[PDB]
């Protein structure tokens, strides 16, 4: 299962690219460079909620949903595991 630790990075990266592709062209979109785009992913998948970056495009919100479903699920497994791996040492 600890291979999700990849599904995430796949998602995160896909989320980045698509988010920008999606967002640019919309006047006032702050998600228009690939780096921020990544932090946005990470941000989203974890759902830390700093609210520093988010989509405005009808479409960008879609990439958001995908990053949420895929990323939350995904990131959820990476933790489930890391929780176990600790239960052992202790």
């Amino acid at each position, epitope marked *: 299962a600890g291979a999700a630790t990849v599904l995430l990075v796949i998602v995160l990266l896909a989320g980045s*690219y698509l988010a*920008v*592709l999606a*967002e*640019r*062209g*919309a*006047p*006032g*979109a*702050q998600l*228009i*460079t*690939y*780096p921020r785009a990544l932090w946005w992913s990470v941000e989203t998948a974890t759902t830390v909620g700093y609210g520093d970056l988010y989509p405005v495009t009808l479409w960008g919100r879609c990439v958001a949903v995908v990053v949420m479903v895929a990323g939350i699920t995904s990131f959820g497994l990476v933790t489930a595991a890391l929780a176990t791996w600790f239960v052992g040492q202790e």
Partner: antibody, heavy 118, light 108 residues
Framework: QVQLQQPGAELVKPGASVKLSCKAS????????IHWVKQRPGHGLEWIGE????????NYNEKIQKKATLTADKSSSTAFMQLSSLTSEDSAVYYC???????????WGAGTTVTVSS | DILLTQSPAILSVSPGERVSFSCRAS??????IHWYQQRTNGSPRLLIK???ESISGIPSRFSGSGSGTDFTLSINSVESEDIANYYC?????????FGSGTKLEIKR
């Protein structure tokens, strides 16, 4: 070596249209955006539009009147800006630049001087 | 869309002196401001990126400062080769925009 090659000049009669070019070289990625900037003599730089060849999508400056249509050609690494129905107003130097999707234009073209005259 | 105010339009400085060009944003843009140099008949040239980050191939004479809505491009000990037009450009919100421009001018 020089990264963006643009034709030094292009003459055009009012109402006519020219398709400028910009051939790349050096490093290339799927995150690259090629931009076009208009500059009339004396005045400053004016963003016209942008395109992502590794996908083909393009967005244009909504303030100015749309007189262009961007296209790219993956294989030859060449971006094309089609300017239609020109007037004295459209005469100026047009630069193409490469943006690594991080917001700034690292390298620029020599620019193509364009004149709209009979 | 974001407005980049570059004023004064012309700057007159004495050789070797320090000069400062200022760029003001119509709204906070963090540090997503970039500087370009353009000499008579040349093409623009990236000088500073992200407000302060340097660039290779550019004199250590050049530096940047600021965040939010107020930015400054500096030159320590100006000189003939520095006579040009300086522009600021932002990538905070779409679509990118440019400053009106500021012509440096040395008095000899």
């Amino acid at each position: 070596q020089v990264q963006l090659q643009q034709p030094g000049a292009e003459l055009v009669k009012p109402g006519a249209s020219v398709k400028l070019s910009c051939k790349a070289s050096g490093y290339t990625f799927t995150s690259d955006w090629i931009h076009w900037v208009k500059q009339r003599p004396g005045h400053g730089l004016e963003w016209i539009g942008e395109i992502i060849p590794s996908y083909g999508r393009a967005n244009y400056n909504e303030k100015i009147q749309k007189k262009a249509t961007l296209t790219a050609d993956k294989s030859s690494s060449t971006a094309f800006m089609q300017l239609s129905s020109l007037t004295s107003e459209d005469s100026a130097v047009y630069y193409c630049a490469r943006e690594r999707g991080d917001g700034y234009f690292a390298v620029w073209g020599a620019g193509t001087t364009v004149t709209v005259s009979s | 869309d974001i407005l980049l105010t570059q004023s004064p339009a012309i700057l007159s400085v004495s050789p070797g002196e320090r000069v400062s060009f200022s760029c003001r944003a119509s709204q906070s843009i963090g540090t997503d401001i970039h500087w370009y140099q353009q000499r008579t008949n040349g093409s623009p040239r990236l000088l500073i990126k992200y407000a302060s980050e340097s660039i290779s191939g550019i004199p250590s004479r050049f530096s940047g400062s600021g965040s939010g809505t107020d930015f400054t491009l500096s030159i320590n000990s100006v000189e003939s080769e520095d006579i040009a037009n300086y522009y600021c450009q932002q990538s905070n919100r779409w679509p990118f925009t440019f400053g009106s421009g500021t012509k440096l001018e040395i008095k000899r």
